[PDB]
Assembly symmetry: D2
Homo-oligomer: 258 residues x 4
Amino acid sequence: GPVGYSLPLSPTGESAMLTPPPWHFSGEVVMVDYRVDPDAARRFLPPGLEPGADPGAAAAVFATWQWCSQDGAELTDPGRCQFGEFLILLSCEFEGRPMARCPYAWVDQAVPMMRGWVQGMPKQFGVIHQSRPVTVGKAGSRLAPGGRFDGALSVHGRRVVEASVTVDRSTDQPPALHDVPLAHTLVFPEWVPRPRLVASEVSDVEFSPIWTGSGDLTFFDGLGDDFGALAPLEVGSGHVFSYGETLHGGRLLSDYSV
Amino acid sequence: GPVGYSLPLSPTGESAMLTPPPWHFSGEVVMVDYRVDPDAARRFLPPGLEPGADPGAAAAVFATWQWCSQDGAELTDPGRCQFGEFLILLSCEFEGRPMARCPYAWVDQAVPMMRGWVQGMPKQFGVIHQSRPVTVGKAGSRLAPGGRFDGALSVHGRRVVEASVTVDRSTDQPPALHDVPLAHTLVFPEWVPRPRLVASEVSDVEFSPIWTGSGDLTFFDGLGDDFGALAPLEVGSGHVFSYGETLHGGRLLSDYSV
Amino acid sequence: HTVAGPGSAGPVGYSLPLSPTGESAMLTPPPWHFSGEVVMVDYRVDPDAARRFLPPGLEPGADPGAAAAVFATWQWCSQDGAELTDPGRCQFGEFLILLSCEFEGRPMARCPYAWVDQAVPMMRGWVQGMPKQFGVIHQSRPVTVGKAGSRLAPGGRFDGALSVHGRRVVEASVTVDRSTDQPPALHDVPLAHTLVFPEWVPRPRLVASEVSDVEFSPIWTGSGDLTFFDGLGDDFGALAPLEVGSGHVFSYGETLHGGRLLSDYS
Amino acid sequence: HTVAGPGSAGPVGYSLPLSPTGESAMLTPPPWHFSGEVVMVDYRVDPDAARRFLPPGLEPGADPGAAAAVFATWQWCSQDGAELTDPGRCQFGEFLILLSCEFEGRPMARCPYAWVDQAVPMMRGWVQGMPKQFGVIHQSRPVTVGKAGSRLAPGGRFDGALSVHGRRVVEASVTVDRSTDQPPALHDVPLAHTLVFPEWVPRPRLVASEVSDVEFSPIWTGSGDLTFFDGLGDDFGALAPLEVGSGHVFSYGETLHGGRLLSDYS
């Protein structure tokens, strides 16, 4: 019968929408650390995932990614290997180890959306805009003190998040929530339901120098009251940097069996 | 902990991308029946699904849909309740009962894509164009003898299917492959794998008068050799009609257990 | 040199890009035929605000406060019908504002703002003086089978929405009650546009679009709802509804031929 | 009446839509600043075919067969920089063909075809005579961390693709070998355009775009590859490569001010 890593199944397996991991990623990030209501954050954490050592720590993350499979084949089709993304990250712990929970994420390409659900990452579809550094001319900012970088998310035609970073300095200190394991819930609707708590296993994590400065972040109505509960109480530092990793698969944290 | 019919989980369950079934559909269809190589068709049928009483019968189906949940809430946001689709259908049987297998499908909205995978329908993302009947002016065709209606699919920026129907007459005979149960394979990649063969349960199936005439159908390179194997040997009748149904859930055909 | 014509040298075309045979041109010469589906809401505008969008030569409407918000989806083609076989090339959606005005005692409509979702109609709009910009436009379509939508029948509801640069800026709804053969007033009068294009190295002209073979389906009418939201600026905001009137759902056809000069201001 | 200026009556603006304050206009007055990333392939074109795209006044290039296929992504803003805070408003991608030509002994480039993926740049292109249509344009970006891409270093590969109306019509690749400070010839000369807009109720002018503060990063050069596919018509097809030369990857900036008249054909 037909086969494949994913649908659609086909006689040779080549038609599958997704390729088996590992996948490599190289991206550009614009990120704002912020303070969330810890009581609201707790309600997005499933059983086994406990409040951060700093329960109020969150982040809003804009990124643009290029990705490919182990053979690098997607790289020659920039239309197939690129996507933009906006995510929320919440600080948490599993058995005393710091992690990040991603309660919400939006992307602008279908393959990364479906591949997100594969790993338990709750990706939906949206329109994501992000400033890029320039090195010539005047139409933009440089990676240098005073440089400003903006991000915006619209979902279903409504502008729901805007963020800005004005950088002051370069550091080798990665933003905390972008240098911990991500703990997701693997679950898929039952058509004819055993959620599992899992962590994504990554290797070869690499950061450019991090440009950091002041952050600004605003949420707007249009995603519902549940999302609104994660709006910033206060906004902290912003970071602009490049990031790479190899994403290998999942490790089971808990299947909630007894 | 947070809940929901699907990701993202949230404290009240409202953030979920998908709503529980049943879902209602009302659509406009442009469909071409064609002859496929029966040996190529057989290779797309999983265990338990056997060749049609007419193994060579296939169809190419363009449709535009409006859909909503039981409460009808999506209908007031046309941007959320509409999508376009192109599908291939192959004739098959399960335990002596005629069904259709959908080996390939493309849609232009994320919610229907993910909801397709929920039901085992192998939807990917593409750009789908479809002619619409007009009732005034000269810029189009009427639902009347001589009226022509076109469909086109581009995937990753490549034009891969084009079809046309010129209708001759109205009938009350639904196209065979659009009036049988659909048999899908429920399977999702294993991140840390028990495919199931299922049929979609529908009710309240309704057709407009069917306008039927000559069909034309062309495949072009750009989807791979596996897809190419399903190219038409011969092209038969085309049909233009409206269609409604309520989609309730799955029934298990086989879980391949022993 | 740019007109295909006797002894012409350079490349030619009705529009850019010019090419040796003229086939490359983005636009085709008129006439163009249109067949569309409309969801329209009549509303009351501040007449003093409306007046400031009317160029010299155009006087306030017989009812100066009469306006309309118009959602439409179109199919179009040139005389040879060639575009109709490529639905991806011959379809677009649109949202327009219309204001009641008059030229020398004759009712017309001014379109101060329009958004479309395809480039060819956008440019062709500028050619005729219609001020089209790009946006995302959604519109309900009647259904005839199933439950997922409304029928053209009493109680049927039809919605429209416009987003521009990722902000939701107009939402409209009509719930129809009854059918009539009375076309909405602002959809059955000449449109008066201003022809002007930026100077790179301007002399505006007031023109009317000449159309023929105007055709309406039966008109389904009932209550309208209309809301403007921030994101298009205060100039646009001045045209927000004071009160919202009847909504209309109908099909429309016409042939558009070219422009007639109302004034070149000499 | 359409210029904001002393005693002006009607609505005003640099372009449509006109409005009481002029704020609604789709376009802003120049100058505009550009900062971009380019992936370009030099190629050999049929010189006799190229000649037919050159209007009177423009002579064949010193090397008549020299052409280029250019992929670029841009950020742009007006003098006040206001657009830069809305990345969704200030970015676009582009694919262009360039042909070598001369005006009165001076090297220039003719752009017979261009496609962009945003409406404002499309219209602003027509304003300056650059024949821009709408398309989908993809372009590799260098990476500096990780494995999912190429570095600006020997062996780095960068790709570009154009689809128009859902058909894949151009694909290009560069594999870079070495860095240089020598800008690609067709990206460091004035562009000579034809100003023409359809008449609704045409007098073309040959113009050059005036730019300042032209700036190149170091240029990464190596082998180029370039393939045209059917779907843009035979006029465009005539410009397909006979042979493909060097590819170049670099960053580019300039300020664009306005047009200079080369000939109004009087």
